[PDB]
Amino acid sequence: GAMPSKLALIQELPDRIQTAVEAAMGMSYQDAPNNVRRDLDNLHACLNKAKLTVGRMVTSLLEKPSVVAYLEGK
Amino acid sequence: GAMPSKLALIQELPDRIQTAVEAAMGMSYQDAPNNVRRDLDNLHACLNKAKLTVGRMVTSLLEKPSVVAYLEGK
């Protein structure tokens, strides 16, 4: 019976956001004109970048033992 | 029933990320000292921000008719 610790949450945030935008990443915008689908291409760069910023924001929490320990509850 | 189209996805992305991050927002980081929980405070500001950067990224796509129409399938 392992109730998820805050670190379970902070670590899963990347996966949650991966799931948050997997829909849009797997979106087939190629049935749209280049420019508008490029707006999805911007969604592709920036929203995937958004996962990138979040993943590493978690990394920013993960680069310090005290912060990490509190998340896991150590 | 309503099979989700690309617009259903782009519109739900905000809620998906609101969910991707709700766990961390509802996190009881006050269990930790000010500074380390402040590290979660940065997590809060930046992840709440992160949701909203996606909020505006969706808004970016949402503020042009060609882009929007292709998402919905108009």
Curated annotation (Swiss-Prot), chains A, B:
Domain of life of the source: Viruses
Record family assignment: Belongs to the nodaviridae B2 protein family.
Transmembrane segments: none
Disulfide pattern: none
Role description: Binds double-strand RNA (dsRNA) with high affinity. Suppresses the host RNA silencing-based antiviral response.
Note: Encoded on a subgenomic RNA (RNA3) synthesized during replication and which is co-terminal with RNA1.
Protein's recorded name: Protein B2
Major place of residence: host cell
Entry's free-text remark on domains: The dsRNA-binding region is required for suppression of RNA silencing. The N-terminus is involved in homodimerization. The alpha2 helices of the dimer bind parallel to the stem of the dsRNA helix.
Name of the gene: B2
Residues covered by region (RNA-binding): 3-74
Any single Gene Ontology cellular-component annotation: host cell mitochondrion
UniProt-annotated location(s): Host mitochondrion
Keyword RNA-binding in record: yes
Keyword Oxidoreductase part of the UniProt annotation: no
Keywords assigned: Host mitochondrion, Host-virus interaction, Inhibition of host innate immune response by virus, RNA-binding, Suppressor of RNA silencing, Viral immunoevasion
Native species: Flock house virus (FHV)
BP-aspect Gene Ontology terms: symbiont-mediated suppression of host innate immune response
Subunit structure: Homodimer. Interacts with RNA-directed RNA polymerase.
GO molecular function, one term: RNA binding
